[PDB]
Amino acid sequence: NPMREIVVKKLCINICVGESGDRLTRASKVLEQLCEQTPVLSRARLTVRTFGIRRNEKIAVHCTVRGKKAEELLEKGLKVKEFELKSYNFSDTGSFGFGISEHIDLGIKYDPSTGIYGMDFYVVLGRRGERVAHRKRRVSRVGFNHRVRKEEAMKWFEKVHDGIIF
RNA sequence: AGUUUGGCUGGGGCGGCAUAUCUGUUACACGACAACGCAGGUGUCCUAAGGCGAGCUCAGUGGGAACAGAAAUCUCACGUG
Ligand SMILES: [Mg+2]
Ligand SMILES: [Mg+2]
Ligand code: NA
Known part of the structure; x- marks a missing residue:
């Protein structure tokens, strides 16, 4: 089927630094530079003496990208690796x-x-028509065979660009 | 000089509060029911922790990402509470 192909939905970049000071401020500038898009801050949940953090204190900064910029950003990361x-x-x-x-x-x-x-790259792949599980009205579940499985994931990877070590 | 120096109570005293009150059980499938019976609370706290509209889904579990580990942040799925 023409719309059974696998596409890249979104690519999420995350920078998990400690503290909530100028280090966080500079990291946000770097991310918004590479992302040309406003990032958002994240706050902790618990308080850990070992990690030296308190509850609801600014820790990390992240963003998500969809479209052509997501594709080219992914290419740059794979080039580095x-x-x-x-x-x-x-x-x-x-x-x-x-x-x-x-x-x-x-x-x-x-x-x-x-x-x-340093940064983290995460890529989410899925077919077309998953909105049934996200729309406000008449929300349902995607079909099992329509879901993307792990084996098809590497096959997609090798197709565009190979190089997976088992 | 005048007067006073609580109560309940397996005698009275010391102890305790069963002295005004809330929840579960004793309690015998309407309602009502005792003991110094059992297990626990109350004399406070909040301009928001009050009022309404909208959006969202919690506890937890599993698969994934540099430092990052059982535990930090991001992502997907399940999840009758
Ligand atoms: Mg009766
Ligand atoms: Mg009755
Ligand atoms: Na008496």
Whole structure:
């Protein structure tokens, strides 16, 4: 069927830094730069003495991207990881992710003020017509065979660009 | 000089509060029912923790992502409470 193909729904970038000061402020500037889109902050839940954080205190910053920018951002990440992944990176849901250690490598001019950060990339894949599980009116469940499974995920990956090590 | 120096109570005293009151059970499938019977509360707190409209779904579990681990943040699914 023409609309049984697998497309990329969204790509989510997350930066999980500690503290709630200038480190968070600079990280937000870096993310909104690479994302050309306003990011949002996140607050903790519990209080942990070991991690030195309190409840509802600013910790991380993240954003989500859909469309062409999502596609090209994904390409840059795979280029940094030379289009090479591992077997234990794909979930049975039908998604996968990875992480770069230095934000310089993506092709961003280093600035001596912001510093160097690492980031997380997560990609969600699914067919067309999943809105039935998200619309306000007459919400239902997607069919089982229509759902995306893990085996089809790597096959999609190799099709666009191979290089998976089991 | 005048007067007073609580009560209940398996005698009275010391102890306790069964002295004004709320929930479950004793209580015998309407209602009502005792003991110093059992297990616990009350003399406060809130300009929002009051009023309404809208949006959302909780506890938890499983699969995934640099530092990150049993436990930090992001994502998908299940989830009659
Ligand atoms: Mg009767
Ligand atoms: Mg009765
Ligand atoms: Na007496």
